[PDB]
């Protein structure tokens, strides 16, 4: 077991204690298998995204709403290039405070 | 106590605010009543945005952090609630307190 | 329908949508078998406590775990006659922000 | 990056800190680990809290929210995690984020 998978491993104990809604993780193509068979042991919903030029996948678990919702605006697109209320919206799934992803949907905002 | 229901809900929505329960309020309240209510909010150092309602004689009174203020400002200044993207609904209901999974739930369904 | 229960209407709204994990109510005895009723209609666990020397009744609703726990503890007592730590976690039932539930429990440890 | 996996998921819980998911983290790391990692924090402005283990050549460090530290300072200093009422078990995981209905539900099966 690998440094990144590791860490994986780290993330699903939080989501099961219920720390959050979701959790991306971004994996090995390599690893993903073994990083899918944990989720399934625990029946945790998932949603695999691979980055196109890379051989690294961004794994998302959580909630089946939430994996239902990345779809069907994160499908084949880069997660930089989400629009400010794409990114506030998963921030929040995430877990980040609110305030917080009020204060960088205002940067974004503003910032440009 | 002396105060009328929407003003007794008003008072508590102050108190889930400064509880820290959810990062926003919204309040609907009759006109003759914002003058209290935003009376109780200056004396409590609470942030807020007024705006107007489909109904004439009520005021919709946003409250909460700072940085949500100036969020809202930016998306529903002169808007409905009800002209709101599924986007931009999701974000108001996360600013609530709303249950992410279930607003990704009524995000699906609008989208 | 009278101002109570215009209220409590409002934090089952509140329940329904998320914001938190469990509602403390207090009503007129005469207004539990409604408020109960409407709780049912929903399917919405709820405890309530009748108070000794009142005609008002503490009605709790909230997350099933959460009225199972609140029975391990509350049932019988005064809510005032909790301790430092039993107000801590009733609080964090509540929904009340952590940080601030930490500072109210040292503020109870020390101000005594 | 150039850092072990337990110092990544440090920095990770660092993150989650200053993104707002938690008031406070729980790591346990290697003696040798933990002057970086309390660099890290004072760097960053994060209050903790560092204490021994069962297992000798680690440490506990909890970091949060100041509240928090002077809360955990109060019950937990010199005692083992294990060691803990049932309501002190529930508190210490609300501190670190978990899920309150979760919290319940355990709670009732130590009680």
Do not use: W
């Amino acid at each position: 077991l690998n440094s990144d998978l590791r860490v994986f491993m780290h993330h699903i104990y939080e989501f099961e204690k219920g720390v959050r809604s979701m959790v991306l993780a971004t994996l090995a193509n390599d690893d993903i298998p073994y990083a899918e068979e944990r989720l399934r042991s625990r029946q945790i919903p998932y949603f695999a995204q691979p980055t196109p030029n890379t051989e690294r996948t961004n794994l998302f678990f959580g909630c089946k709403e939430c994996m239902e919702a990345i779809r069907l605006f994160v499908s084949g697109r880069s997660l930089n290039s989400l629009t400010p209320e794409e990114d506030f919206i998963i921030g929040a799934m995430l877990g980040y405070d609110i305030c917080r992803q009020c204060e960088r949907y205002c940067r974004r905002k503003s910032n440009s």
